[model samples]
Target chain A: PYVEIIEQPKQRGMRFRYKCEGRSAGSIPGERSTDTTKTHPTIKINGYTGPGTVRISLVTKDPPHRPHPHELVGKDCRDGYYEADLCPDRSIHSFQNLGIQCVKKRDLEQAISQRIQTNNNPFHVPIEEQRGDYDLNAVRLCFQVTVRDPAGRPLLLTPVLSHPIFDNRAPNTAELKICRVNRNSGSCLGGDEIFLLCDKVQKEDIEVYFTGPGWEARGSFSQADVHRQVAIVFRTPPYADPSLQAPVRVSMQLRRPSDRELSEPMEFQYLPD
Target chain B: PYVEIIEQPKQRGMRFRYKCEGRSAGSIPGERSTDTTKTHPTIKINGYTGPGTVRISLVTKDPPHRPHPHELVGKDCRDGYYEADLCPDRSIHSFQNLGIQCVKKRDLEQAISQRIQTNNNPFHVPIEEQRGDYDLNAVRLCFQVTVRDPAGRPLLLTPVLSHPIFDNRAPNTAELKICRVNRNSGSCLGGDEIFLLCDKVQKEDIEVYFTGPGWEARGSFSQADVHRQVAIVFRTPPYADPSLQAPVRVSMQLRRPSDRELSEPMEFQYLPD
Candidate 1:
């Protein structure tokens, strides 16, 4: 008997909450989840229906997939993982409350110690490796199923891992949110000042990008124009078709040079001189 | 002999400060002030300059211009006005340290009473009129110059009133500032959601307006979408030339329907489908 994933967890947008946030870590959503129809990560057990058990745990995204120090907390969670007995009548199991609780960077060592002491280290990764190059901003969910053989002995199925889940608070992995902008339109000749407000951004790594059909440009500003990492004051670049008579529309977005990540694009117009 | 205003105080952009704000009420800028060259409100004694006395007081903008309840606080200020002995060598006098100190709405009565008791009323406006339909959000600077005649007698020139100075904190008179916008570009066909952050705006009276050379439209939203009078969530309107081939630029602004006041416009783009 083997277990197969029926649905994969969404790869991004969900924020991994810290324990000090004093709020629920929130559930991971299915890849296809939407506003009107909600869905959750699901798995099915093939050729095994009677008194089987399933266990879910967090694991490192890359190989030598070590057990992640982060905990998976939810309805059936215990010992930093989720486990439940499967009913004979049902082969499919859906998870609705699985949450990823992250450990603080300073508390990583203690968390790993607890994992090793409880024998919750699924991959049996060496203690030294657990303290090494594992990414703290991302984790993957590993699923394992167990069923009884004809002689009533326990049998284990091959485990499967889901896509990487990113921590929203991490600057490299955080979702880009643009909150406000002072000016949206500028002359085709450009040199118009615009003030923008957004979520946390690295001043050295961020860019105000403008793009259109076969053309592109970056807003003009230095690191000094990035205000407290929440706002940016910049000047628009001249449009390619500066001599055009009519106004033209283009896309403007915040870009990070480090990860090549971009915010959802906003509309900007270039008016004729 | 008459006094002529060489430069007027800038009518707007300066914010009036309250005593409780614990910050200095910044100096009023000259009407022609620019970043490179600083200027101040200046008046010239057209016919005489020897030891002339110039008194500047806050006055109402409307007819039967009464003494404003607000105080003029800064250098050479006494009671509620600015009084300075003009240098005999200079016929033109410039003011640089005049600041408008506003009275709380709750303290209007006491402020008016002080004006009456101190005989600071320039127009001899009755106490009843001072407590009536006078606008608290606006005031004008009235300039009166006194020069000695040939017989060494004091002669008063006609008091000249400057343009209105608006209180930036007042809801009706406040400068409309767009701090940010969630999206600056949208489809030419419009109906795209846009979230905007701004200074104080009246929900019922504010409108998101779009305009071009000869075309105009408005963003679609109800008063319920205005969050805390500081932010607005609305939808873009279809561009005038939706069927056009290339992207087009247009102007978007916060419009107050009551006073027909429009904010400095931002740019919005419409792209081809």
Candidate 2:
């Protein structure tokens, strides 16, 4: 008679892969997944336990909840969504291999037209409003279940949606990684040159930040010092104590000025003159 | 007439090159050398301006100042030392091309014997007490000035020794440089694995230290994690704040446990959970 999501899908970290990537879009993990224990998005039927069918699809995360242009691919998938039979003895179902396949920005119109033709637009979103309204970076998993009555007739249930899943390829959501550096330490008086290599970053939005308890400074460099968006050459700022007699240790990392997003920190030392 | 040292040789940083290195030993720098102005060790005659011969020789830095086994091997060098005739009109002489050539440890005795026979030993140290008493890692420059008194007779002034010049090749004095690191940032809760490449180090005597104001920690690693004395694989120590809300920056470096020597510091950032 009714259905509810017992275990929600993880809300972040999973990347939405494009078809041109030429690699398998990995499965979505459950919210409770850990190093030793694995779980999956689960759903359960309430008040009724007869044989039923469960359908899973992607939908917009915001209000109006229109059918998403993205597709759910992998085991038990068909026509861009998932459909599977549920046993009468079992009231619960778990999904472990649901992969999100995203369409390129240029192909969004064609993909939406195909969804309309296949009658997959569950929320009846107007064709004209669908093009520019898609978030493209996020989607929610929608689950719908149905059971048979004594007359053996089919019945429909309300659809429930999970939290938003973000596309890691998006500039706003990508992970930050520092690959290498030319030097790991400098003088307590600072003003030393440092060369760093890292994953893709926006030169205008990134900062080399040095910080310690109650103290912080930014590395000095212009946008031109960011080589091809993967490397940076900068001069360190002076430490708080110019006449420090002993070495002082602190942390440094790449930070985004826009979102305050930060890379993991590496250790650095400041030595006496 | 008395001889006076107007400028002294730099006491450190210049590496003493071995003949086997097969490269030109660089000139010694003056103590006052800077980015904008260049200078060299200079000596002036206090009460005379007449022509004279100024001889520069290597000697032990400590009391008695016996002849050193090292050789001066650049312009105007002769018989393992430097000698130049001074012009009568110019009482001050600047040395710009003095290079220190170090003798191998195994050949020290042979070099010392040659110095003894050539009359290069100004203080006349006994050969029996010279073998193990020499501090091979450091030496001083002895300046001996000879001028003619009224009758044209050569009069040798008292020799004066400059400050000690350390041999950088010594294990305790070698420079520490970090060439690269696999990653630069980690969680504030810090159990991150890091792979670091550096110059030569003693595994048992070196440590990876992390420090910030009012807090200090050491990286977790065994001597076995030091790869061939040039690289190390270690786990980062946790930051003081486990529930850090924003990224906190700090410093890290290599420290010699025996001498408390430290490399220049690099920056690292600790992230919130």
Q: Best candidate per TM-score, number? A: 1
lDDT at A56, model 2: 87
User: lDDT by residue for model 1 over B76-109, one digit each (tens)?
Assistant: 8866788988788889888999998888889887
Tens-place lDDT digits, model 1, residues A1-273? 878888999888777778887554488899888885888999988877687788899988988788888888878988778898866679888888898888887887787777788776567788776666658888998888888888878888888788887877777667676777767888999998886777778897899999999999999999987765767778999999887698899999999988888899999989897
DockQ of 2: 0.01
Each candidate's DockQ: 0.03, 0.01
What TM-score would chain A of each candidate receive against the reference chain A? 0.88, 0.88
After superposition, candidate 2 runs with Cα above 4 Å error: A22-25, A128-131, A149-152, A257-259, B1-273
- In Å, residue A273's CA in model 1 sits off its true spot by 37
**TM-scores for all candidates?**
0.50, 0.48
In order, what fnat does every candidate score?
0.00, 0.00
lDDT of 2 by residue, B15-80 (tens): 898988743468887889876999899888887778689889999878867799888878888767
Clashes of 1: 16
